[PDB]
Design an enzyme around this catalytic site. Structure first.
Site, PDB file in Angstrom:
ATOM      1  N   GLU A 166       8.182  -3.137  -3.966  1.00 45.64           N
ATOM      2  CA  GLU A 166       8.887  -3.963  -2.980  1.00 45.64           C
ATOM      3  C   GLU A 166       9.993  -4.848  -3.554  1.00 45.64           C
ATOM      4  O   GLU A 166       9.920  -6.074  -3.469  1.00 45.64           O
ATOM      5  CB  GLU A 166       7.869  -4.821  -2.213  1.00 45.64           C
ATOM      6  CG  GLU A 166       6.745  -4.023  -1.567  1.00 45.64           C
ATOM      7  CD  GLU A 166       5.785  -4.881  -0.743  1.00 45.64           C
ATOM      8  OE1 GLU A 166       5.792  -6.115  -0.922  1.00 45.64           O
ATOM      9  OE2 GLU A 166       5.021  -4.348   0.096  1.00 45.64           O
ATOM     10  N   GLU A 352       1.110   1.691   0.337  1.00 44.79           N
ATOM     11  CA  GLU A 352       0.343   0.598   0.919  1.00 44.79           C
ATOM     12  C   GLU A 352       0.365   0.702   2.431  1.00 44.79           C
ATOM     13  O   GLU A 352       1.413   0.880   3.047  1.00 44.79           O
ATOM     14  CB  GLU A 352       0.877  -0.803   0.592  1.00 44.79           C
ATOM     15  CG  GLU A 352       0.841  -1.187  -0.887  1.00 44.79           C
ATOM     16  CD  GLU A 352       1.309  -2.595  -1.180  1.00 44.79           C
ATOM     17  OE1 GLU A 352       1.388  -3.438  -0.251  1.00 44.79           O
ATOM     18  OE2 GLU A 352       1.590  -2.861  -2.371  1.00 44.79           O
TER      19      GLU A 352
END
Length: 444
Positions: A166, A352
């Site tokens: 991220e 995720e």
């Protein structure tokens, strides 16, 4: 609802990050990270929570590996903490740090679990932040040296590598909003940090390719499908701008080697665009073997000419998690098909997906997390439908293996399929994990 079944070669895993679970923050000569620093200053993390101890996984890893095995989970995504390996960021290698990861990796493999390693999951050595952190391209160079060491030590046995987790969150929350370490509040600097992070990704990919190991390398991006709050052209354009920042900035960079021109114009016109080197990614772009997707929720957006990128998220009237995030499995189908539509046939992994709920052990010692189970059922269903539509989705990792330190939210937000009592460190497998074990078994 009918029981879900994935193809036998589908990869089912669960994921964690070093700072969120390891603890042992000062042991074995580990260096201070930016998160050690950030969480030790008051006002940064809810209730002054920190990762000093977390789930004590640095000590309890053997039993935690057995928990994975007991669920029939055969893939495990985790991160390696840079400052355990180079306490100062570069220079002298810390052998105890490498040895911890060698032991963890060997433990996973002995127990039939394939490791997927995230090289950087936000724990920059503090010594590197003292020289500018991700705003300084020298830090990207030190990152590649650190990646090269990991490839050399473990690449014989680890076949899935994630360069960065991220980068949008790391740059935007860490350098623009000041909500994550290092806590800076400068959008122009954040965009520079994001640039250097991408540079470090491509350079690590280039280095990896020379090794001819049997594996694959890619980046993980947080992505959130955007919808217009209405049918007015105004609102539709606002949703496309939020999509430009949330999704396209890093998607276009990682998959095409360019930044979206509409967003460059917006950032330039508001004077937040940093001066970046002239060549951009024209000389360094490298194709990844896969794209890792972290998906949790959607954004519904209306125009607001006074807002950042003229876009404002609308709070929706729908069930939501303890994070306040709308439960929207359709967003995941929409995202997966969108990625295949816009960027072609690159292998995809959900690195995720999961949910925070108020879970607790009941009078019989169980953690009956039906909300998470239902969340997971609907999201796996959406993923399976995307596969039917031809999306090359190869695997799915649940965030998270166990409840952990949820960054600036502290310990208050529980994402695990395994409950952790922070006073005693007891693990209690939740109902959702047992459902997952059955899904994996059925698909095998």
């Amino acid at each position: 609802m009918e029981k879900l079944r994935f193809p036998k070669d589908f990869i089912f895993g669960t994921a964690t990050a070093a700072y969120q679970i390891e603890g042992a923050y000062k042991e074995d000569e580990k260096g201070e990270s930016i998160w050690d620093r950030f969480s030790h200053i008051p006002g940064n993390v809810a209730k002054m929570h920190n990762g000093d101890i977390a789930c004590d996984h640095y000590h309890r890893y053997k039993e935690d590996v057995q928990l994975l095995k007991s669920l029939g989970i055969k893939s495990y995504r985790f991160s390696i903490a840079w400052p355990r390996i180079f306490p100062k960021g570069f220079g002298e290698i810390n052998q105890k740090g490498i040895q911890f990861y060698r032991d963890l990796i060997d433990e996973l493999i002995k127990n039939d679990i394939e490791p997927a390693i995230t090289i950087y999951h936000w724990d920059l050595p503090q010594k590197l932040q003292d020289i500018g952190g991700w705003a300084n391209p020298q830090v990207a160079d030190y990152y590649v040296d650190y990646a090269n060491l990991l490839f050399r030590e473990f690449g014989d046995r680890v076949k899935t590598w994630i360069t960065h987790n991220e980068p949008w969150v790391a740059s935007y929350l860490g350098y623009a909003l000041g909500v994550h370490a290092p806590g800076i509040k400068d959008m122009k600097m954040a965009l520079l940090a994001a640039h250097n992070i991408l540079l470090s990704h491509f350079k690590a990919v280039k280095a990896y390719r020379e090794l001819e190991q049997d594996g694959q390398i890619g980046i993980t991006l947080n992505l959130s499908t955007c919808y217009s709050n209405s049918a007015d052209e105004e609102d539709i354009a606002a949703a496309h701008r939020s999509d430009g920042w949330n999704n396209r900035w890093f998607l276009d960079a990682a998959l095409k080697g360019t930044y979206p021109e509409d967003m460059i114009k917006i950032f330039s016109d508001t004077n937040i665009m940093p001066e970046l080197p002239k060549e951009l990614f024209t000389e360094v772009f490298e194709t990844s073997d896969f794209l890792g997707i972290n998906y949790y929720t959607r954004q519904v957006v209306k125009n607001n000419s006074e807002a950042f990128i003229g876009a404002e998220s609308v709070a929706m009237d729908n069930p939501k998690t303890e994070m306040g995030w709308e439960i929207y499995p359709q967003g995941l189908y929409d995202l997966l098909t969108r990625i295949h539509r816009d960027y072609g046939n690159i292998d995809l992994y959900i690195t995720e997906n999961g949910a925070a709920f108020n879970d607790m052990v009941n009078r019989d010692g169980k953690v009956e997390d039906e909300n998470r189970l239902d969340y997971l059922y609907t999201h796996f269903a959406a993923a399976l439908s995307a596969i039917e539509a031809g999306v090359p989705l190869k695997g799915y990792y649940i965030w998270s293996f166990m409840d952990n330190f949820e960054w600036a939210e502290g310990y208050e937000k529980r994402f695990g399929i395994v409950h952790v009592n922070y006073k005693t460190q007891e693990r209690t497998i939740k109902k959702s994990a047992y459902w997952y074990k059955e899904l994996i078994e059925r698909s095998n």
